Design a protein around this nucleic acid. Structure first.
Ligand SMILES: CO[C@@]1(C)C[C@@](C)(O)[C@H](O)[C@@H](/C=C\C(C)=C\C[C@H]2O[C@@H](C)[C@H](NC(=O)/C=C\[C@@H](C)OC(C)=O)C[C@@H]2C)O1
Ligand SMILES: [Zn+2]
Ligand SMILES: [Zn+2]
Ligand SMILES: [Zn+2]
Lengths: 66, 441, 815, 209, 81, 111
RNA sequence: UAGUAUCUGUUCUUAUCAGUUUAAUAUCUGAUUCCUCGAGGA
RNA sequence: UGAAGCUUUCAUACU
């Protein structure tokens, strides 16, 4: 429960999906050749891709329900 | 089926680069990081050739690399943070030509994780403390000391955790043998997860937080925290103590800001643009790397934009206060991942893709007619400059690099008997098709 | 109301005799409460409780933390009480307890940070000029703590002012003592302020008062000791006065100046170090003849410090330093002097480490024969230290003869059994090696005489010597009277003292562990039957050595003993596997392996199965361990058929025993099991299909041990097959069964990979029933905590809805 | 000649047959793992070598007999393919090709990486060489651990556990250890350091330079 | 029942009673990695004491090979409270 | 305010994985979507059974676990041959009928 | 020593809805002179 | 064809 990203019987789809999006972005920031792949694919500098991922970290999957 | 793996040609792409006196003598060396390879290089100040001294496979993912030196020592150490849950400190042994592991400290599980530190690594400029940080709430601080045999001792970590917090960059602050300080670009996302309207996601600002380590009381405390005007990328340590003020440079979108705690106001300078630019007008401009050069008389910075333009940044100061930031166009080189300014007047450029470059800094000082921009200049509207061929730098050496390889075909397209390797590599207008042959030239 | 706040701040009793949760709760609440309570009542009550005569250590620690927290909040309101607090806590800084000193320094540091520098100075200044020497020491230590807390440049002006005071010499003395205590307390952190402190204190070396000169020299020595191996251009205005003073002073002040010189010399270059050494060396040679047994210690320390530098070379040392050193310090008066004895030994060893072992070793080796045994032990200690640090490359025929004769005469002339002569004899013989051929007859005669009689405390020392020297004893092709010694050691097998029996067994084992059975003259057939009743002895050393000896005999001389006795010995060793000393268990495992390798797996395995069928729990567990040992020494291809044939017996608690044995077998053999997973798979299927809870629990344990045993060996097919039978048990309520199932799942997470586990969890993660969701999220959290990084490549694709984006687009890029 | 191999962006491999007389494309086999395939190479009529965005190489081989003639069990195809090899490289591979590099040498699998690296995977031909190199790797995993604190077996098992690959970049670090540890390692393999060095050089010069 | 606060340099110890069996999975086969404990569990009179029964420590505490394989050595101070 | 089985069967791409209780979940659309992933074996099917797991029938009598062909050829039931036991175990080794990852075992599946 | 399992015994209107809860049941909570042979049942 | 659950005063076995 103290670890961030764990769930329980009341976990919703939104929390699950934002958790996997957030640690996906962190894994992209960590691995050197995944960021290379993305920066070649979208034709940007690697610093720009890193900053874009950090900016996307705040609200991935949009704002929550109700 | 059982397979044996062999490497024929190692990786040649550079991720991080540090410089220092790693052999203990007066000459300077560079330590570069590949993805999973560590490498020591030494550029010759007589011919300008870059020679490789040592290269080791580490079997991990290097994520942060720093150099530090204790007071009174003549040798630099290497701090590595990786995808393991350990911080490692290394020492180069010139007589054995190998890296000797000095210290190992375990703090968490392995892998590139959200909340396990290893992505960010900062060190105190005097060398008495090191901070390892994750992208999320966890931060750790180690105190570095020395015994009577002049060997390095490490302490147990101090925690500085803070939930629901994202970190963009951490740097150590240069104080005058006062308590060590660390600066962080932070963002709190707790409010954004509770608002279904989506308005707490916006209206959320970065903060510049300062962490003070009290060596007398042995704990880390949050001293200052201020909200910023817009979201910024990496930070730059300003040299302090008895040579310079003690603050930070925040690089941001279209701006660069100087900041210090106390009675110092904020100073902003907009980044100049190229006159008659052909790029989409909706796009902004950020800095991608930086390089500091300290001299016993003065200091300056070298920052590069995404277009590959290096500007020379100086700081107009008072007894203690900073009054202006001045920017001047320096040169245009390929977009680099790291830049190292070496004593004896050499600039090393490690590009994100393609060949790397070593330049001779030919023109010291600045006796020129080109305009110098300032933060004191009024503008309703942005500064403009004209890019030109190299004037301050001379190309001395070029290191080949096959990164990134995108397509390969092994075939005998000439009428030799040995096949050749035809490699489509490179990105943008620096791409090329390379033919590789086994042999010497 | 006044006692209102008192009755409510009995929170400190809430904490003192209280539980940890309410400890921290009351801590936080009293921290919030402090600013309103006021420092007056709070301190008025806490300082008595901290002054309590019988308070504990950790109660004191918690009180100090309370002080820290209530001091951080109320910052500038503590001023009118500072003086009072100090009179309570200016002691605890000269206390003989280290942690009391740490706590007092922490309290004073937090007090100085709460208050200001001016307040501390104004309350501490009146006691600067006091006449009671007990106050001037705590005052200096507290000023040092304040300088360490608030910084050195903040106190530099007050220091510069106080040690220029022309009013009294006590103020100057106390200021210089403050600088000295600052150095002592802060260490190598004074280096940026070294020159400032040195120019502040330097004018005291030429004062008209003799106490000021002494304290200035002591402060210079403290700074130089804190600065080492740096700091020398800051010690420049002191070189002239210090050396002129050692040239003119005489006595206590001379000793202080010489200590300063000695701490300053190792900071120089070769020139200055070489030039300065000459001057202080003529002075020190003159002072070799002075009286106080403090002066000798200081002189020895300075000699050791200076003779360890590069500017001083071995030629000058042997020409000028060694004759007077060895003429004045090496007399038994030094030996009965317990204070400087260790200092003399260390100084002599560190001298030999530069000048060469031969000269020192000769000059003291002629003295190994002496009427006093204190002087003998001293020389022996020094000699063996030099020998261990250098070895003995330069021993000559003459020196070898003298060494051997001396150590032999010293061995016999021994009143009480000491480890000194034993270790000396051992290391001397071990360093000589194959060179001591005739002194081997001599040493054998000596150890024969010592081992023959005299109380078994000499006999056990002789046995230790044999055990540590038998290698070089046989190393020269001399065993024969080696056998003469083994015969006597054999006759010394009935001993009432177990300590001597342990050494006897060790010596016998060391002999036979290098003496071939062919030529081990006591026939193996006779020895062993004499040896088997000793296995029932209850001493640990006797047991371990006996088991090791029987193991060696079974490993090499298996041919002589008729079997049956080996079977009896192994069945007796079976009970030693439960021994509560790791050593005994380790030796028993080794010996059982040797006996099994010797007599063959068939008969011992039949006996072990019979024994597993009929006995109580602990003996059956030991039998299981023994079966695993037999199967590891003799390949499991010899054990598995007979063990699987026993599962065909129709009885309950019989199959469960087979399953427990298989569990421990796989756990014990680990990597060797990669060739035997296909053979036990149908049995595990049957047991996993078995209604009995133990059958499924034990089968899960087997699966876990097998999974963690084979990892990286390509056994994923059978493990996936077995997971197909383990998984349906996740809906089990029995705690032991579900515990074993979780263990097996976490073993399969390593052996099979996290991708398969996520594939098994996906459809249940979001089931409508809460039971399924609880179970699956427990399994998923266990899979997620280990290998969080690998799961990145395994997550399934989830499509975007109208509100939120869920596709990971970067992984869809195609170069 | 007969079959078609399809790479999915997130699924690994689909086997298809073209019915020449019926004019039909029928799926007859697939895999049981999600793979972000970057490139693929055919090794023979039944086996495929694949690469991944996350830096892994894998080999998949079809089971014996099969059908060939077709007219789901996991929401997929009825028949499945087995994974016979798994290896983490550490860099993203974008090219795989089976070829012979030296004149008069043996065929190897050459791969190419996004960081500019080039490497090969070569098959063993005898059990003795395989066992010797396995023991070398085992003993070098313990007495010469990675420099930055990583576990070697755990690094090559980053996303999937290793299967049937020996890391020859760890094995060639034997030639750069100190003589004392080289002797401690060599005396367990019942051999001297020069013999181990010669055996290491033999397999390299058999295939590559 | 486990302390589990991030540790440091203090080396965990075991008493004579259980010397050589894991602290996590209490096992009798193959030790691997040295045990580190938090500073609070080694502070003051607690230094060198057994990580299971707070009694006198005579040997270094170890995690078994199976625990280090499963990275159960990275979960924090295993001193039993 | 909850779907019916036929109503939810009309919304999903794969209606044959929908079951009785699937309309009673907190998020049935995600549940049915995960039930259709191209992998991911289902739940052990006895969660709703009140007879717990296994047991149920003690009628069937099972003979002692039959030894493998080669081991039963070794003639274990006096001169014993070791080389025959070794060579036979390794050289005569055979692979038993393994099962696929998807396949699961139930109480009545052994008959 | 005190925990589990297996036999034996018991096991709650073929009368209707609502609420808590449950996957759904289950559980719990509330409402809805006549016949037969001095008696029983509805 | 089938669905054997729940409880205790039972009684009997294993830890
Ligand atoms: C009664 O005290 C307890 C229960 C608690 C304790 C920790 O305080 C005490 O120290 C501890 C010590 C004695 C016992 C019985 C515990 C550990 C030992 O037990 C023994 C009974 C096993 N026997 C075996 O290991 C089987 C085989 C042998 C030879 O080993 C090996 C490695 O093959 C396992 C273990 C070695 O037991
Ligand atoms: Zn602890
Ligand atoms: Zn204990
Ligand atoms: Zn363990």
């Amino acid at each position: 429960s103290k670890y961030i990203g764990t769930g329980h019987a009341d976990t919703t789809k939104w929390e699950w999906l934002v958790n996997q999006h957030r640690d996906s972005y962190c894994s992209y920031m960590g691995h050197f050749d995944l960021l290379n792949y993305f920066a070649i694919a979208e034709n940007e500098s690697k610093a720009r891709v890193r900053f874009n991922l950090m900016e996307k970290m705040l609200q991935p999957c949009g704002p929550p329900a109700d | 089926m059982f397979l044996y793996n062999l490497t024929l040609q190692r990786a040649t792409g550079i991720s991080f680069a540090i410089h220092g006196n790693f052999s203990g003598t007066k000459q300077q060396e560079i330590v570069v990081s590949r993805g999973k390879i560590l490498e020591l290089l030494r550029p010759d100040p007589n011919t300008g050739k870059v020679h490789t001294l040592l290269t080791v496979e580490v079997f991990g993912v290097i994520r942060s690399l720093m150099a530090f030196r204790l007071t009174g020592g003549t040798k630099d150490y290497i701090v590595v943070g990786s995808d393991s849950g350990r911080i490692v400190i290394l020492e180069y042994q010139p007589s054995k030509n190998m890296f000797e592991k000095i210290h190992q400290e375990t703090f968490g599980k392995s892998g590139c994780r959200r909340i396990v530190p290893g992505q960010f690594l900062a060190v105190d400029p005097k060398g008495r403390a090191v901070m390892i940080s994750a992208i999320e709430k966890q931060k750790l601080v180690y105190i570095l000391n020395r015994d009577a045999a002049a060997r390095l001792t490490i302490s147990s970590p101090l925690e500085a955790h803070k939930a629901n917090t994202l970190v963009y960059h951490v740097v150590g602050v240069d104080v005058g043998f006062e308590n060590p300080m660390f600066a962080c670009l932070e963002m709190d996302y707790e409010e954004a997860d509770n608002d279904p309207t989506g308005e707490a996601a916006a209206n959320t600002q970065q903060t510049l937080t300062f962490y003070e380590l009290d060596l007398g009381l042995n704990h880390v405390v949050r001293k200052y925290s201020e909200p910023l005007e817009e979201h910024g990328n990496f930070l730059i340590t300003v040299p302090g103590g008895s040579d310079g003020p003690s603050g930070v440079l925040i690089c941001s979108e279209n701006y660069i800001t100087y900041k210090n705690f106390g009675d110092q106001p904020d100073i902003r300078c907009p980044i100049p643009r190229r006159r008659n630019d052909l790029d989409d007008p909706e796009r902004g401009m950020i800095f991608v790397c930086s390089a500091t050069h300290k001299t016993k008389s003065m200091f300056f910075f070298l920052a590069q934009t995404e277009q590959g333009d290096i500007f020379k940044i100086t700081l107009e100061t008072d007894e203690d206060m900073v009054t202006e930031i001045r920017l001047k166009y320096f040169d245009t080189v390929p977009v680099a991942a790291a830049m190292c300014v070496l004593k004896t007047g050499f600039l090393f450029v490690a590009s994100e893709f393609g060949n790397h470059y070593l330049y001779q800094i030919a023109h010291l000082g600045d006796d020129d007619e080109e305009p110098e921009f300032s933060s004191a200049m009024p503008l309703e509207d942005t500064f403009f400059f004209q890019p030109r061929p190299l004037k301050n730098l001379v190309l001395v050496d070029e290191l080949d690099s096959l990164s990134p390889i995108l397509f390969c075909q092994i075939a005998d397209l000439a009428n030799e008997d040995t096949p050749q390797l035809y490699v489509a590599c490179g990105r943008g207008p620096r791409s090329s098709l390379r033919v590789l042959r086994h042999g010497l030239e | 109301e006044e006692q209102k706040e008192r009755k409510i701040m009995k929170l400190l009793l809430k904490i003192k005799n209280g539980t940890p949760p309410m400890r921290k709760a009351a801590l936080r609440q009293i921290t919030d409460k402090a600013r309103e309570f006021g420092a007056g009542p709070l301190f008025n009550q806490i300082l008595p409780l901290l002054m309590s005569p019988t308070l504990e250590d950790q109660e004191r620690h918690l009180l100090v933390k309370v002080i820290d927290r209530i001091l951080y909040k109320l910052d500038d309101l503590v001023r009118p009480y500072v003086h009072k607090i100090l009179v309570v806590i200016e002691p605890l800084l000269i206390d003989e307890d280290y942690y009391a000193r740490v706590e007092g320094r922490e309290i004073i540091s937090n007090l100085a940070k709460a208050a200001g520098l001016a307040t501390m100075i104004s309350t501490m200044r009146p006691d600067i000029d006091n006449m009671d020497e007990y106050v001037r020491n705590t005052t200096a230590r507290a000023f040092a703590v304040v300088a360490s807390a608030l910084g050195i440049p903040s106190l530099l002006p007050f220091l510069k002012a106080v040690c220029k005071s022309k009013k009294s010499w006590q103020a100057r003395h106390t200021g210089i003592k403050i600088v000295q205590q600052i150095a002592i307390l802060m260490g190598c952190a004074i280096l940026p302020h070294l020159r400032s402190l040195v120019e502040i204190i330097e004018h005291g070396l030429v004062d008209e008062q003799q106490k000021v000169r002494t304290i200035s020299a002591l402060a210079i020595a403290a700074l130089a000791e804190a600065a080492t191996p740096y700091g020398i251009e800051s010690f420049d205005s002191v070189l002239k006065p210090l050396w002129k003073g050692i040239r003119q002073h005489r006595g206590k002040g001379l000793a202080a100046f010489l200590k300063a010189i000695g701490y300053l010399i190792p900071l120089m270059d070769a020139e200055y170090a070489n030039y300065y050494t000459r001057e202080v060396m003529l002075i020190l040679i003159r002072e070799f003849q002075s009286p106080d047994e403090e002066m000798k210690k200081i002189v020895l320390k300075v000699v050791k410090q200076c003779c360890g530098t590069d500017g001083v070379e071995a030629n000058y040392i042997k020409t000028e330093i060694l004759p007077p050193f060895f003429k004045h310090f090496w007399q038994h008066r030094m030996a009965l002097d317990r204070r400087n004895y260790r200092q003399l030994v260390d100084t002599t060893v560190e001298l030999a480490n530069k000048v060469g072992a031969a000269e020192i070793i000769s000059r003291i080796v002629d003295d190994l024969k002496d009427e006093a045994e204190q002087y003998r032990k001293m020389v022996m200690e020094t000699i063996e230290k030099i020998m261990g640090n250098l070895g003995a490359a330069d021993i000559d025929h003459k020196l070898e003869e003298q060494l051997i004769d001396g150590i032999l005469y010293a061995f016999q002339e021994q009143t009480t059994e000491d480890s000194v002569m034993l270790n000396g004899f051992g290391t001397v013989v071990n360093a000589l090696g194959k060179r001591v051929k005739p002194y081997l007859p001599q040493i054998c005669g000596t150890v024969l005489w010592r081992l023959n009689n005299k109380s078994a405390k000499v006999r056990q020392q002789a046995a230790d010597l044999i055990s540590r020297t038998a290698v070089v004893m046989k190393t020269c092709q001399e065993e024969k009277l080696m056998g003469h010694l083994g015969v006597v050691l054999y006759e010394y097998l009935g001993e009432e003292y177990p300590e001597v029996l342990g050494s006897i067994l060790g010596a016998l084992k060391a002999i036979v562990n290098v003496i071939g059975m062919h030529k081990m003259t006591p026939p193996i057939k006779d020895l062993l039957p004499r040896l088997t009743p000793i296995l029932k002895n209850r001493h640990e050393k006797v047991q371990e050595n006996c088991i090791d000896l029987v193991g060696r005999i079974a490993d090499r001389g298996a041919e002589y003993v008729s079997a049956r006795e080996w079977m009896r010995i192994c069945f007796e060793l079976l009970e030693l596997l439960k021994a509560h000393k790791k050593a005994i268990r380790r030796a028993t495992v080794n010996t059982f392996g040797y006996i099994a390798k010797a007599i063959g797996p068939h008969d011992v395995l039949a006996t072990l199965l019979n024994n597993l069928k009929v006995q109580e729990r602990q003996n059956r567990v030991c039998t299981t361990v023994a079966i695993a040992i037999v199967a590891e020494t003799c390949s499991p291809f010899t054990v598995l058929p007979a063990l699987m044939n026993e599962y065909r017996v129709p009885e309950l608690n019989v199959q469960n025993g087979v399953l427990k044995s298989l569990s421990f077998l796989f756990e014990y053999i680990g990597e060797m099991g990669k060739d035997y997973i296909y053979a036990v798979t149908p049995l595990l299927e049957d047991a996993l299909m078995d209604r009995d809870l133990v059958h499924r629990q034990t089968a899960s344990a087997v699966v876990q041990h097998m999974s963690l045993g084979v990892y990286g060996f390509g056994c994923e097919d059978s493990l996936n097959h077995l997971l197909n039978y383990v998984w349906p048990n996740v809906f089990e309520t029995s705690p032991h069964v579900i515990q074993a199932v979780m263990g097996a799942l976490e073993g399969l997470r390593v052996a099979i990979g996290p991708c398969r586990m996520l594939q098994y969890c996906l459809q249940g993660l979001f089931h409508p029933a809460r039971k399924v969701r609880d179970v699956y999220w427990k399994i998923y959290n266990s899979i997620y905590i280990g290998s969080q990084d690998a799961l990145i490549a395994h997550y399934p694709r989830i499509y975007n809805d109208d509100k939120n984006t869920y596709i990971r687009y970067e992984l869809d890029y195609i170069l | 000649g007969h079959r078609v191999i399809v790479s999915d962006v997130q699924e690994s491999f689909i086997w298809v047959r073209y019915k020449r007389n019926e004019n039909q494309l029928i799926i007859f086999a697939d895999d049981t793992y999600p793979r972000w395939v970057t490139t693929a190479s055919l090794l023979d009529y039944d086996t495929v070598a694949g690469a991944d965005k996350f830096g892994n190489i894998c080999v998949v081989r079809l089971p014996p007999n099969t059908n060939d003639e077709v007219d789901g069990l996991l929401n997929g195809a009825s028949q499945k393919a087995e994974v016979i090899m798994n290896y983490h490289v550490g860099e993203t591979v974008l090219s795989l090709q089976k070829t012979t590099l030296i004149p008069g040498g043996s065929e190897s699998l050459v791969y190419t990486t996004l960081s500019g690296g080039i490497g090969i995977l070569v098959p063993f031909t005898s059990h003795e060489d395989h066992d010797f190199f396995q023991h070398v790797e085992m003993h070098l995993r313990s007495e010469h651990p990675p420099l930055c604190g990583r576990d070697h077996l755990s690094f090559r098992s980053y996303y999937f556990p290793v299967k049937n690959v020996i890391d020859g970049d760890l094995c060639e670090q034997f030639n750069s250890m100190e003589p004392n540890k080289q002797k401690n390692v060599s005396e367990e393999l019942d051999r001297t350091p020069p013999e181990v060095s010669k055996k290491l050089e033999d397999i390299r010069t058999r295939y590559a330079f | 029942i486990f302390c589990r606060k991030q540790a440091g340099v203090a080396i965990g110890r075991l008493c004579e009673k259980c010397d050589g069996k894991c602290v996590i999975c209490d096992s009798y086969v193959r030790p691997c990695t040295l045990v580190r404990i938090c500073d609070e569990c080694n502070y003051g009179s607690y230094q060198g004491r057994c990580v299971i029964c707070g009694g006198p420590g005579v040997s270094d505490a170890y995690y078994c090979k199976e625990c280090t394989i499963q990275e159960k050595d990275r979960d924090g101070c295993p001193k039993i409270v | 305010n909850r779907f019916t089985v036929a109503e939810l069967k009309q919304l999903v791409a794969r209606p044959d994985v929908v079951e009785m209780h699937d309309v009673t979940a907190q998020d049935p659309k995600l549940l049915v979507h995960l039930k259709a992933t191209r992998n991911s074996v289902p739940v052990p099917r006895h969660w709703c059974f009140k007879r717990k797991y296994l047991q149920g029938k003690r009628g069937i009598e099972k003979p002692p676990f039959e030894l493998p062909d080669f081991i039963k050829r070794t003639g274990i039931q006096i001169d014993i041959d070791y080389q025959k036991l070794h060579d036979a175990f390794f050289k005569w080794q055979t692979k038993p009928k393994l099962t696929i990852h998807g396949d699961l075992y139930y109480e009545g599946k052994e008959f």
